[PDB]
């Protein structure tokens, strides 16, 4: 600090006094981003909790767009026999945005679930639902025996067993014209060499797990350089209090210290502004509580030192700041043996002016030598060290007043005193 004062004064000799040198600024320690509550997630339940699903050949396509997608309910939930994704990390889904989403829901036999994958073959893949080789999305399946099976054979679900050509990726074929399986044309007449184009699984509760019906939902994400309509929930940071931090409440960005607030906002009110129009209080979007905003330090740093001709030690004053902030002055970066000694020790003292380090708080009172402020003064005397004391207004004296006594002088003294007054200035043009 003494060298800093020397540099500030542009001199190697510093006289007795107090000099303003630098500013103690507290930098933020963390970052906080808070956004509205979980809110309106995309309608996953509609597809998943749907009472009845369509057929594999008539697989139902559901377009999802313009909504926040909370994929955590998919993998965080172990209510799915099969869970896999292609081209993306399943855990990363909650932090991804997509232009469009297509949920293909249907029912197929459990043993046939293997056919639901890129480059798969078989009747289900070829003629009921074909996937692209480079499919980008996720495939989900779960058991549906208790839902898609009935005693005596459940014949509601149908699948396409015959067709002229394999279905293209994301292609559905609902036309059920009699397929010409033989040289003799069927002419739309079922019979020999002309079989019912669809087929019914006939799910029964006695069916084995492999043969039991299984409900499958496939989420395919479309990215065509277009604006993203779906976006995973904006993960909001936790709540930090009583510490300097950069906060961003649903776009309202600021830096300060969040503290519990005793205000009372109206239900429609979000944040308050001071008389100067500066933001003063804010309410968390996720949950309804109010917090107050305060500046961090905004403090200044001054150096108290007797004349270098007299001594060499110094004392540091951090203006209008707590004594816990003092050592938070970008410390761990100054000189190891010279600045950190003034960082904190038993010498620390607190006054209305600010935190004072390097001066002992004695009880005795003396005439002010270096004015600290708020009635406190500092001086160098004692073994010699710096002492901060309370200013002595003057010597104590009482006049022996009485209603018939008097004091008359008997001798005098002639005193000569000097008074200096400026009269002019250099005539500069």
């Amino acid at each position, epitope marked *: 600090p003494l060298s800093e004062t020397k540099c500030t004064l542009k001199s190697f000799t510093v006289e007795k006094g107090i000099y303003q040198t630098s500013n103690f600024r507290v930098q933020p320690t963390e970052s906080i981003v808070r956004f509205p509550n979980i809110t309106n997630l995309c309608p996953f339940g509609e597809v998943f909790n749907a009472t009845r699903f369509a057929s594999v050949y008539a697989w139902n396509r559901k377009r999802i767009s313009n909504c926040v997608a909370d994929y955590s309910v998919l993998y965080n939930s172990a209510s799915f026999s099969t869970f896999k994704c292609y*081209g*993306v*990390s399943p855990t*990363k889904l909650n*932090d*991804l945005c997509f*232009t469009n989403v297509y949920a293909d829901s249907f029912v197929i036999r459990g043993d046939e679930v293997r056919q639901i994958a890129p480059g798969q073959t078989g009747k289900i893949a070829d003629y009921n639902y074909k996937l*692209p080789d*480079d*499919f*980008t999305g996720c495939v989900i399946a779960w058991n549906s025996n208790n839902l898609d099976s009935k005693v005596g054979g459940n014949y509601n679900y149908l699948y396409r067993l015959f067709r002229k050509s394999n279905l293209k*990726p*994301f292609e559905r074929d609902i036309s059920t014209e009699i397929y010409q399986a033989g040289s003799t044309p069927c002419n739309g007449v079922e019979g020999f060499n002309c079989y019912f184009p669809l087929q019914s699984y006939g799910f029964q509760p006695t069916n084995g797990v492999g043969y039991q019906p299984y409900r499958v939902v496939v989420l*395919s994400f*479309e*990215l*065509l*350089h*277009a604006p993203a309509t779906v976006c995973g929930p904006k993960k909001s940071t936790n709540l930090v209090k009583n510490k300097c931090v950069n906060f961003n409440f649903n776009g309202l960005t600021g830096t300060g210290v969040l503290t519990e607030s005793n205000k009372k906002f109206l239900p429609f009110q979000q944040f308050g502004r001071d008389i100067a129009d500066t933001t003063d209080a804010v309410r968390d979007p996720q949950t309804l509580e109010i917090l107050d905003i305060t500046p961090c330090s905004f403090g200044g740093v001054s150096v108290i030192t007797p004349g270098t001709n007299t001594s060499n030690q110094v004392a540091v004053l951090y203006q209008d700041v707590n004594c816990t902030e003092v050592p938070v002055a970008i410390h761990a970066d100054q000189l190891t043996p010279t600045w950190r000694v003034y960082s904190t020790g038993s010498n620390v003292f607190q006054t209305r002016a600010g935190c004072l380090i390097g001066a002992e708080h004695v009880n005795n009172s003396y005439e002010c030598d270096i004015p600290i402020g708020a009635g406190i003064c500092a001086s160098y005397q004692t073994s010699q060290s710096i002492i901060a004391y309370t200013m002595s207004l003057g010597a104590e004296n009482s006049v022996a007043y009485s209603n018939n006594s008097i004091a008359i002088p008997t001798n005098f003294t002639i005193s000569v005193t000097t008074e200096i007054l400026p009269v002019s200035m250099t005539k500069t043009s």
Partner: nanobody, 122 residues
């Protein structure tokens, strides 16, 4: 060193009612071209998407170019060609090419090329 790079070509001045075909070549450390797109930033106009193709073959075409520009992805799946049919005055623009790459399965990086100019006059 082989950072993802895009190159655009095929544009130029064309008489109204003509046709051309822009070719976009991708190079560098291309991990996965999840989405592939064509844009145009005409002189004095903001960049606007015209046609794009996802890695799954699905394609989007802007209404300003729908029905005239057809986007096709090459067999190598590294280059995309935008066949411009019946080029109209609105096609006068500096065409740019973009692709989205999922690096590490979590980083969406958009890469752009130099672009090529197209012009239609009366």
């Amino acid at each position: 060193n082989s950072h993802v790079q895009l190159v655009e070509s095929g544009g130029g001045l064309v008489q109204a009612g003509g046709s051309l075909r822009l070719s976009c070549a991708a190079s560098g450390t291309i991990s996965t071209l999840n989405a592939m797109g064509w844009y145009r930033q005409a002189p004095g106009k903001q960049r606007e998407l015209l046609a794009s193709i996802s890695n799954l073959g699905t394609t989007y075409h802007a209404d300003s170019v729908a029905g005239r520009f057809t986007i096709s992805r090459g067999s190598a799946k590294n280059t995309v060609n935008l066949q411009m049919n019946s080029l109209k005055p609105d096609d006068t623009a500096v065409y740019y090419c973009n692709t989205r790459v999922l690096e590490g399965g979590t980083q969406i990086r958009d890469y752009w090329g130099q672009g090529t100019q197209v012009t239609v006059s009366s």
